[PDB]
Amino acid sequence: NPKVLKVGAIPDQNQDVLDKRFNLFSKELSKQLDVEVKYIPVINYIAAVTGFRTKDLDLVWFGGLSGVQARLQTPNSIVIAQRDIDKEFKSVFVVNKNLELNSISNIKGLKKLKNLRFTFGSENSTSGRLMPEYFLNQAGVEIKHFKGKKAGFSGSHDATIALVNSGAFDAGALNKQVWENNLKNNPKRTSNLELFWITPEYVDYHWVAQGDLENRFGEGFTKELKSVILNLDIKQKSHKQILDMFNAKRFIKAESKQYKNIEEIGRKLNKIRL
Ligand SMILES: O=[P-]([O-])[O-]
């Protein structure tokens, strides 16, 4: 249906959170743009990229890696916006309390994760896989050093927390904002977990739009869409509700140039391929 603006997102958290966030976002866009807007869930990160490529999705909340992948597969698409935090984004490594492992204050301490059961997030996660693996490798830790000579891939930051919290895995890595959200608002999910390490900064999440929206929605639509997202205003109750779900005071401009380092890291780890 070409007259519906279809919103998507990488499934980086439990579906209940995603539904609430993206349905509220969609309703606000629909009011301001005077068009039908619908959030369309997907099963995994690959499905977000491929749904964008096939034009089943028009406007998608991507991670750094998955947004790079999507824009490579889908030429002439548009980087729309990000949060302030997405310019200086971080991961956390977490460990199960039962290990009695002390936190570290230097990257070389990641060697303490060798011979443990370790899970990443999605195979295509920036904060849950790509950057954690990069940092592990800098410490001399490779996937083959983990218990079983393999790592888990949980598919989402909430799922990583749940796996380490249950003792299915000893350790994992995830989005630092998600870790903090769970720690405060869902403390039972984090009862058996301790913060192990906070990573250096890198670029992450961003909105990506199709390049052809004008043909369906009229001249100037993409500009209007970008404007609506950038002008979301913490002082307005309905905007606040949306913005709080993104753990942000505002959205800001983002350009394709800024994802060069993620792309290069992706190439080095053979992760540009889905
Ligand atoms: O790509 P995102 O899960 O940090």
Residue numbers in the entry: 2 to 275
What does the paper say about this structure?
To determine the structural mechanism of phosphite selectivity we co-crystallised Te_PtxB and Pm_PhnD with phosphite resulting in high-resolution structures (1.95 and 1.46 Å respectively) of the closed, ligand-bound complexes. In the closed form, the amino acids that form the walls of the binding pocket pack tightly against the phosphite moiety and a single water molecule that is also buried in the binding pocket. Each oxygen atom of the phosphite contributes to an extensive hydrogen bonding network to the main chain and side chains of a cluster of conserved residues from lobe 2 (Te_PtxB; Y55, Y100, S130, T131, S132 and H160; Pm_PhnD; Y46, S126, T127, S128, H158 and D205, Figs. 1d, e and 2e, f). In Te_PtxB, it is not possible to determine the protonation state of the phosphite from the pattern of hydrogen bonding, but given the pH of the crystallisation experiment (pH 4.2), it is also likely that the mono-anionic form of phosphite is bound (phosphite pKa 1.5, 6.739). Both proteins contain a conserved histidine as one of the phosphite ligands (Te_PtxB; H160 and Pm_PhnD; H158), which could help stabilise the negative charge on the phosphite. In Pm_PhnD the equivalent interaction is made to a buried water molecule outside of the binding pocket and the hydrogen bonding network around this water molecule is not sufficient to determine the charge on the histidine. In both structures, the hydrogen atom at the R1 position of the phosphite points towards lobe 1, packing against the face of the aromatic ring of a tyrosine residue (Te_PtxB; Y208, Pm_PhnD; Y206).
